[PDB]
């Protein structure tokens, strides 16, 4: 590439080299999000307040129904919660999955009981986090805490 | 549904004046039922196609929307701005409204009403249309204003999140550039040291 | 204040329901006017306290509930029985261990029976101003809000996706050149070992 062999740190050189290096999406945004978080752990870049949920997919109750695609709450902020999750790499699923530990309820937070029931179904239990847990995921541009709300 | 009471003051009796609360029958060319109430009393009636045709022809009108004129006369889909003299002579038990067409107050209606058995029934009809009124032109504000609050809060949320995301994308570009170039130049410095000690090896 | 129709349903005559268009003046015991109608004949009664206020002072004025009693008594609940002939409205209060009387509303009648009806037609007009047209007003409000939200959510999707793609591509190029650097350093370390 355009990168040399015996040069120390700066900023413009990487811009030039990355211009020289290819621009291709070798990996999918979710898989490469996981790899981005892996390299973030490897070089302690996960402390970046920009993307740290990049490893684990995070369920969202972006809908009037749980684990179903039968609806979509328009005029709401639920797909907005999904984008807030995805901004840190928290991959959004409309159906609860066993690979999910963070769960954000819709605008109304009465869906906790079904979430607990699915925690009984889904062995890797997920904490029942309100909407603000993901509104502040970008509002403060920083991941919120699972302990902030119901477990 | 919108049984709009055309508030008309009779030129015969403005004090005990009649209020055209009709229930138009569909396919007005086939006929309809004229119901009229002055509150103190009431006068319902029936209009046949003979009266419909005579009133259509009164305004020198041919092959058109006179049925629409009757629709706008009976229950007044348009307000009182539609200039029909809804003068019912309760003394004559004959209802007639006139459309001022071709510079003449041509007879738009001549409806032979009949005295109601008891005005109380049509008064109950009037006060249930009154509930439909109570749900007609300035209270579903609450409804789409519940929606308005939802959209205001969500739009402000999204505006903040989008601003923070574009700022975060630029910050991610610059900080990733810094981090990656740090890693590469540290590898290059390790290469420098390794080559130097290879020269010593 | 303006005579507002509070429709009431008599237990004696529920068919032709009444309309206690009560223009209460700041109280119900020291000056009020009640215009009662059944929707047909208007007993517009410019009533005084010489007919009801003594009901307070003659029948054990205790200390539990009176204002609410008379307030609910002017709406649709007790045995509302308005006498058409005497223009007098009365009803019986029911409670524990005793059933008192509450209202002796001698609601006078004016010569015009359509007064309350024409007022109820002004009422059909504003009640008619109670759902859809100012729905349309606050609906252009929530529709400009809806378009704002839709555009900003579209650009929110775009900015999140652009951030993700930028991070992805930067990390791809970094991975490639870092593999270059790692291969170089490993080969150089091997050359160190050989020498």
UniProtKB/Swiss-Prot annotation, chain A:
Residues 48-151 form the BRCT domain. It is found in: Nucleus. It comes from the Eukaryota. Testis, thymus, prostate and heart. It is linked to LIG4 syndrome: Characterized by immunodeficiency and developmental and growth delay. Patients display unusual facial features, microcephaly, growth and/or developmental delay, pancytopenia, and various skin abnormalities. Interacts with XRCC4; the LIG4-XRCC4 subcomplex has a 1:2 stoichiometry and XRCC4 is required for LIG4 stability. Component of the core long-range non-homologous end joining (NHEJ) complex (also named DNA-PK complex) composed of PRKDC, LIG4, XRCC4, XRCC6/Ku70, XRCC5/Ku86 and NHEJ1/XLF. Additional component of the NHEJ complex includes PAXX. Following autophosphorylation, PRKDC dissociates from DNA, leading to formation of the short-range NHEJ complex, composed of LIG4, XRCC4, XRCC6/Ku70, XRCC5/Ku86 and NHEJ1/XLF. Interacts with DCLRE1C; the interaction is direct. Interacts with APLF. DNA ligase involved in DNA non-homologous end joining (NHEJ); required for double-strand break (DSB) repair and V(D)J recombination. Catalyzes the NHEJ ligation step of the broken DNA during DSB repair by resealing the DNA breaks after the gap filling is completed. Joins single-strand breaks in a double-stranded polydeoxynucleotide in an ATP-dependent reaction. LIG4 is mechanistically flexible: it can ligate nicks as well as compatible DNA overhangs alone, while in the presence of XRCC4, it can ligate ends with 2-nucleotides (nt) microhomology and 1-nt gaps. Belongs to the ATP-dependent DNA ligase family. This is DNA ligase 4. It comes from Homo sapiens (Human). The gene is LIG4.
From Swiss-Prot, chain B:
Changing residue 106 to E: Abolished interaction with NHEJ1/XLF. Changing residue 69 to R: Does not affect interaction with NHEJ1/XLF. Disulfide bonds: none annotated. The modification Phosphoserine is found at residues 53, 193. Residues 1-201 are annotated as: Interaction with IFFO1. The keyword DNA repair applies. Its main location: nucleus. One of its GO terms (cellular component) is nucleoplasm. Changing residue 72 to E: Abolished interaction with NHEJ1/XLF. Abolished ability to bridge DNA. It is linked to Short stature, microcephaly, and endocrine dysfunction: A disease characterized by short stature and microcephaly apparent at birth, progressive postnatal growth failure, and endocrine dysfunction. In affected adults endocrine features include hypergonadotropic hypogonadism, multinodular goiter, and diabetes mellitus. Variable features observed in some patients are progressive ataxia, and lymphopenia or borderline leukopenia. This is DNA repair protein XRCC4. The chain holds residues 1 to 201 of 336 of the full protein.
Curated annotation (Swiss-Prot), chain C:
It comes from the Eukaryota. Residues 125-159, 178-195 form a coiled coil. Changing residue 187 to D: In XRCC4-Asp mutant; phospho-mimetic mutant; abolished ability to bridge DNA. The modification Phosphoserine is found at residues 53, 187. Changing residue 55 to R: Abolished interaction with NHEJ1/XLF. Changing residue 61 to R: Abolished interaction with NHEJ1/XLF. GO terms for molecular function: DNA binding; enzyme binding; FHA domain binding; identical protein binding. Belongs to the XRCC4-XLF family. XRCC4 subfamily. This is DNA repair protein XRCC4. The lineage of its organism: Eukaryota, Metazoa, Chordata, Craniata, Vertebrata. The chain holds residues 1 to 201 of 336 of the full protein.
């Amino acid at each position: 590439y355009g990168d040399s062999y015996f040069i120390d740190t700066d900023l413009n050189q990487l811009k030039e080299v990355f211009s020289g290096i290819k621009n291709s999406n070798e990996q999918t945004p979710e898989e490469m999000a996981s790899l981005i978080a892996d390299l973030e752990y490897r070089y302690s870049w996960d402390c970046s307040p920009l993307s740290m949920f990049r490893r684990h997919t995070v369920y969202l109750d972006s809908y009037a129904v749980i684990n179903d695609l039968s609806t979509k709450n328009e005029g709401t902020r639920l797909a907005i919660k999904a984008l807030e999750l995805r901004f840190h790499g928290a991959k959004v699923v409309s159906c609860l999955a066993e690979g999910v530990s963070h769960v954000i309820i819709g605008e109304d937070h009465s869906r906790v009981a079904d979430f607990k029931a699915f925690r009984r179904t889904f062995k890797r239990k997920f904490k029942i986090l309100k909407e603000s847990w993901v509104t502040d995921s970008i509002d403060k541009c920083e991941l919120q805490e699972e302990n902030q709300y119901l477990i | 549904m919108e049984r709009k009471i055309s508030r008309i003051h009779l030129v015969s009796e403005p004090s005990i004046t009649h209020f055209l609360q009709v229930s138009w029958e569909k396919t007005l060319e086939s006929g309809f039922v004229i119901t009229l109430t002055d509150g103190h009393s009431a006068w319902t009636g029936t209009v046949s196609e003979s009266e419909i045709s005579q009133e259509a022809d009164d305004m020198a009108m041919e092959k058109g929307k006179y049925v629409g004129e009757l629709r706008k006369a009976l229950l007044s889909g348009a307000g009182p701005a539609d200039v029909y003299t809804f003068n019912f002579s309760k003394e004559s038990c004959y209802f007639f409204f006139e459309k001022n067409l071709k510079d003449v107050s041509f007879r738009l209606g001549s409806f032979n009403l009949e005295k109601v058995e008891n005005p109380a029934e049509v008064i109950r009809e009037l006060i249930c249309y009154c509930l439909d009124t109570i749900a007609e032109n300035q209270a579903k504000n609450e409804h789409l204003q519940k929606e308005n609050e939802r959209l205001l809060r969500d739009w402000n949320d999204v505006q903040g999140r989008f601003e923070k995301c574009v700022s975060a994308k630029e910050a991610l570009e610059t900080d990733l550039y810094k981090r990656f170039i740090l890693v590469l130049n540290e590898k290059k410095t390790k290469i420098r040291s390794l080559h130097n000690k290879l020269l010593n090896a």
